[PDB]
């Protein structure tokens, strides 16, 4: 949390004490937060990990592989040309 | 005037000045009513005030004499208290049975000289000096021995004559003790025999409550001597007042040479 919005890392450790600079971009993949209920599932409880989080994060994509019929026999077929 | 080395606080001078200190309210702004309590307990340690001598007149200049210089004004002062006490007796005529209370041992506990900022703050420039001192105690040492009057022997004849440390240091003359005889072969130090005196080992946090934060405070052992000894237990926060003191430590191991960054600890004259 204090990373991603804020920007910065702060360290009262022991110690040295000091706010350092982190402003780095992320990237991040998860599971289906337990049970493949992934797709199916609620546009909550899904995720698992509430709360400010889910907003932290500018974009949240959903990758359920769920036909979509038609679509898998494209990506079989493209997978298919690959290999080669 | 019998100047007296660098510490040029001179004998036959301020012991008069603190001779007519006497009988003082004053100012004030006790002093004898308790020094007259004092003389019938035969407790010795006379605990003192400080600051008496400040802003009071005269004596101003020997506050700054044994703030600045505290060795030899604490001994000094002791004589005169010991000989105001020989001259408190001449007053009431014959007391006590009689001259053997005089003879019995005396000595000046000066407390809160100025108020000192912490250990930390502390300058390499002042080592002789009153230190104020507050922090709890981790731990209080097992009492270590201290030579007072040292005994020697010989194989010849053997002879029991002794010779006194005084500074920190032991001669022993080569040859020899009585008579004579000589030989020039070594000295016998008995180890039992001769005097010792109490010295404990105080160790002291520097104020837990004041602190870089979060730096862990640092340690302050000072020494005491004879009555303090062991007159305290532990973690105890209040206050300690004595004269500060940087000495050699023998490094590696061996060799008989010196590690040349003096170690410091405090002799703390007194403590309340």
């Excluded at chain 1, 995720?47 to 400010?52: E, G, N, R, T, V």
């Excluded at chain 2, 002062?77 to 049975?97: F, W």
């Excluded at chain 2, 002879?159 to 440390?165: D, K, S, Y």
């Amino acid at each position: 949390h204090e990373v991603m919005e804020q920007q910065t890392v702060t360290i009262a450790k022991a110690g040295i004490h000091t706010t350092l600079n982190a402003r780095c971009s992320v990237i991040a993949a998860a599971n289906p937060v337990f049970g493949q209920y992934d797709v199916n599932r609620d546009p909550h409880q899904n995720i698992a990990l509430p709360d400010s989080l889910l907003s932290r994060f500018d974009l949240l994509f959903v990758v359920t592989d769920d036909i979509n019929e038609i679509r898998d026999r494209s990506i079989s077929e493209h997978v298919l040309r690959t290999h080669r | 005037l019998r100047i007296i080395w660098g510490t040029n606080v001179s004998i036959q001078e301020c012991t008069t000045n603190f001779r007519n200190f006497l009988m003082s309210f004053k100012y004030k702004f006790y002093y004898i009513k308790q020094l007259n309590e004092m003389r019938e307990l035969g407790t010795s340690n006379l605990n003192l005030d400080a600051r008496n001598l400040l802003a009071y007149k005269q004596t101003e200049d020997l506050y700054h004499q044994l703030l600045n210089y505290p060795q030899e004004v604490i001994s000094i002062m002791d004589q005169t208290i010991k000989d105001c006490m020989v001259s408190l007796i001449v007053d009431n005529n014959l007391d006590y049975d009689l001259d053997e209370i005089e003879t019995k041992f005396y000595k000046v506990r000066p407390y809160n000289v100025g108020s000192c900022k912490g250990m930390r703050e502390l300058n390499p420039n002042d080592i002789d000096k009153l230190i104020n001192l507050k922090g709890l105690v981790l731990r209080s040492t097992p009492v270590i021995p201290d030579m007072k009057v040292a005994f020697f022997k010989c194989n010849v004849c053997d002879h029991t004559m002794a010779v006194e440390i005084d500074r920190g240091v032991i001669q022993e003359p080569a040859r020899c003790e009585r008579i004579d005889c000589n030989e020039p072969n070594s000295m016998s130090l008995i180890h039992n025999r001769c005097s010792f005196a109490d010295k404990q080992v105080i160790k002291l946090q520097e104020t837990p409550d004041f602190v870089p934060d979060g730096q862990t405070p640092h340690s302050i052992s000072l020494c005491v001597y004879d009555e303090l000894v062991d007159s305290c237990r532990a973690g105890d926060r209040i206050e300690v007042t004595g004269t500060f003191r940087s000495i050699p430590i023998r490094a590696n191991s061996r060799q008989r040479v010196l590690k040349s960054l003096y170690k410091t600890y405090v002799d703390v004259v007194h403590v309340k």
